[PDB]
Structures are given as C-alpha cells and as structure tokens.
C-alpha cells in the first residue's frame, strides 16, 4: 500500500521516493527516471529551437531547457499541438517558468505548477491506500505551562501523553502516582522519552488534534531550546512545516500525520470545535476540561496534578478514538482522489475534484487548463455561488423532516452534458438549452466531466450492490466507505464549476445546473404538497424542510418515506427534527431527537460576544426548541435584561491594550483577551473589576424572537 511520495536531490538530480507499507513492513522505493516538464503552445512552430535557448538562474547556476518534444493533446475536447518541455530539476520549472511564457513566440504554457511528487503519482497511475493492509497509529497530545503575555513556546511542556489501541500513558517530569503516568528527570528527558516511545512503536500514522498549528510548533521551539533533534521522521528527519495560505500544515516523512482538526472541521458542524465538544458531539460522552490557569497553579504548587495528568491522558485517548473513527473514511477518499491522505484530509471539496480531474485529464490526453491568474481571477468577480432559495413558512413547526437533493445536480450534469467543453460548441446537430439562462450544451459527444461523473455513479451503484450481496463483514464496511466517498466527490462538481480558482471553472455550467435544478425542485415540492399534503417550510440548494401539519413523528416519517419511493437520481431523507423555525432564506434553527440544536445566521458575526449574551441565547433557544415555550424564553430575556473572551483600534480594544501593556502584557497573535466594558477608559481586563444590553444580550436574541412577534 502506497502511503505517499516525495523527492530528494542527489548530485543535482531529483530522486522520487515512494513510501509504502507492504505485508507489515515499511519500505521506500526510489526512482531516478522521472523528468519534470510543462507545456508550451508556440504561436509558431518554427521558433522552437530558439525558445529552448531561454534560461534562468537558480542557486547562482543557470538553468535551461533540457529537451523539448512535440506532442498531440486535446484542450477542451479539441486537438491541440503543444511542446512538452523537459528539465533537469523540479526547481528549474518555477525559475524559467515566466520567461519561457513571456517569449514572443509563445502563446501560453500549461501544467507548470503541479508538484513533482504528485505529478509522479498521476503520470504513473499510482493510487495511495490501495488495499486492506493494517496500518498502526499513535495519537499524541501535550500539556504546557502558560502565562499571559508569554511569547509562544516560552513556557515548558509539562506532559506528553500518547495512546494507541493498547494503552494511554503520560510522560512528565514531576512526580505523580497514577499507573499510567511516567515521571522522568527533565522536560528534555520527557521529550527524549517520547521520541523513543514513538521510535519503538513506529506508527504508520501519528494522530493529533491541531498538531498542524500548535503541538508540532511548540515541540519545535522547546527542542530548539533544550537543544534536541526532533527526529520523528522514519528517515531520521524532523517534522516538516508546510504553509497552506490560511494556516500551516506539518508532515512527518515516512508516516502519515493525521490532524483531526481540518477533518472534523468539515465532516461535522458545531458551534464550538474544541476537543471536548468534538468528542462529545460524536461519542456522546462528556470530556472534562482543565484550563491553562489551573494547569499552571497546579504545577507551581504540586497540588492537584492528578487531575491534569488525567486530562492529558484523556486528550491522547480521546484523540486516538476520533482518529480511528475518521481515518477509514479519509483513506477511501484519498484512494478515490488518487492523492496522499495527508493532502486529501487537508483539502477542500473544490480541490479534491481538481486533483481527480487532473489525474483523469492525464489518462485522456486532456491538456489541463491553468488556475486563474490575478487578472482572470479578478474577472471571475468571485465565481458563482447562486442557487435555489425559497421564503420560509413562519412559526414553530413540529416533526420536521429533511429532504436532501444534492444528488440531483450530478444527474443534471450528466443528463444535459453540462461541461465547459460542450458549452456553445459551434456546429452541433443537437443541443440542450438551459431554462432562463440559455447556455447551449452540445450533445453530439459526451463531455469530459459529465462522462467522468457518469462513471462514478456507475461505480458507486456497482459497490452498493456488491455490498448488500456480501457475507464478508470486512468487505461490507470497506465498500461502504468507498460508496460514501464517491458520493462526496460527485456532489462537489456543481460547486466546483463556480469555484473561482478552478481550472475547469464554468460559470455557465453552474448557472445552467441551477436553472434546471429549480425546475425539478419546483416539481417535487408540488408533488410533496398536493399528492401528500406535506408542508414545505424551507428549501435551498441542498434540500428542503417539511412536515405534515398537525401530524405525528411516526406518521410524518412514515408518510415522508413512501413519498420518496413514489417520487424516485435519488432523493435521500437526511434528517428529522422534533421542532424548528426559519426566520428567512438562510436564517433558522432546529432541534433533533437527541436534542442537538442547530442554527444558521441567527445573529451578527463578531468575536466579542459576552458570556451573558451567549448564555442567554442558548437558554432562549432551549425553551423554544426543547419546550415550545416562547413566553418562557421571552421572560428569560426580560429578567436577564459578563466577560468578553475575544480571540485574536476600537473603544474597548485600545483601552484594554494600555491596561495590559501597563503591566508588561503584550497582546500576541492567536491569543484570547478577557475584558469588561464600561463606557482609553471603555474596557478593563477581566481580572481587575446599557452597552451590555443594546450591543450584547439584545443583538444575540434580536432576530430569534422578532420571528415570534416581539
């Protein structure tokens, strides 16, 4: 099973390494035969010999074209002849890149920004995670000592906990009598012990929960200080930092760093994404939280470390569980997309599609379109994110059912051959035309995307069947993940078409799918109401919320079931809510059987919500959704009518910075500040102690109860 790839330089030349785990033993395959390249479309075939004379300089040395050959490919279905330019080193590309394009005899260049190691996987048709090989995993966490105004990584690490399917221990340098705690001499020795623990277990996967932005970075600093070499890599190398625009991402050569945050962030949707919230909102068990403060005072007092050690133990244990849960899915996805799970698990749906397409484009000799440049990206004025919207039915409704119709869109792309290479193609014998928008989509030939899209659904349907007709409990679970993976990819093409950075961007395609979509949604709504007497309260691009007024759960459910069998592209019943209410087009809140409330656009977006404004809301919305008591929630506001734990030149802001600075606290990035407001005198640090109504508790519950008539 292939886990990943990368390249190493040796005598100036690139050497690909393929990290695999076969029959229980880890291995590295090397390849010195792969040559990097990119394409050049000459505006004149005669100017080739000269274009190969262009050079650039890298590491003081001069780089030039190693070799150029003419090839025949198709750009958007139509024949094109381009020059495949070879080089000696992957790094040559970004150097000479722009200068070759700028050459007077060159129209444009393509496939010049595809990472060598990814390019290798594609051009070689290698698929990561191809089988059923058992992979070992180890989750790890750390507890550190922190004090306000402390530059990052300044304080030491108090404990390093780790866990796997067999145990969950804690490594610390202070005496603690727990059977799982392990006391050592110093911090340095504790870190050394960890690297030693990791080295003996030698896990294929290291699971963390935000290790991409905290854990690894911290250990790095401490290691830089205590003078240690953090050699977690299976090749003795240290963790490597990769910055991905927004945040950073850390890799550990030879192993898979599975950071559960980017994943759970997507896969699940909550109000708070803290480890406690996540574990609870998944396993339904509670997790006790021990804050930095207590940690410090407990360490600097030798009083109560049994608790912190428990929390550290739990962090690692709880991380291993979540990782064992979300890993099988991510592995199937990565296999479908054909890229490393390290990459896949960190990618957006728009990018999962793009990688799938790139691989397929290669298989079909389809030259790929470039990402949008600065200019072109400006033209797209943001892409297209329009969709079908309604106008909710006011009031608090019961036993709501949720119809998901994201499965519609892919059928529509296949059905009308919606693709950028079929749109308004001249000289076709047959065309389908988008209602209201009028984009024409040729049908004489199957388009690139529609064509792939069809294949996926075929594949998925094949699996679902092989899955129901199987005695192998393992295979069943396995196939279930793959079918669920295909669904994810399939349902991302619609959005991808309007995603502004997309190479195969197609606002028209997107607009047309939206048009045809409206039609269909219109028809099923009608059928729902008339033939089934259902009440549709809310509908948007993803699905609708509806109930049979005055009926019960058992029936509204029963009834909704048959409607699907009747009306069925498949429509999935994805949700039942004991209560709910919709304020407008995108604003609303629902509660389910287990009680897990949910909301959307119910208040203004800000990061300075006071503890009261927050606690008041949850109480208002809990009386309504959990008790259908409006007067209740309203009498809760009246009487309720204290800190602001803002995360990181406003009235309070400036005032707070002075007060902190006044005692040496520097406001550092990515930290939380806690103040109280009381109109450089507006606010005051929490520790040392009207607006709070008309700019706090009111705005938090203003929309909610406006919808109920107040």
Tab-separated table of C-alpha atoms in Angstrom, residues 526-534 563 566:
chain	number	residue	atom	x	y	z
A	526	UNK	CA	-45.680	20.450	-5.744
A	527	UNK	CA	-45.893	16.660	-5.630
A	528	UNK	CA	-44.970	16.783	-1.963
A	529	UNK	CA	-47.735	19.195	-1.009
A	530	UNK	CA	-50.639	18.198	-3.293
A	531	UNK	CA	-50.281	14.405	-3.508
A	532	UNK	CA	-49.033	14.022	0.052
A	533	UNK	CA	-50.366	17.036	1.899
A	534	UNK	CA	-46.912	17.903	3.185
A	563	UNK	CA	-43.270	9.855	-0.833
A	566	UNK	CA	-43.149	7.333	-5.002
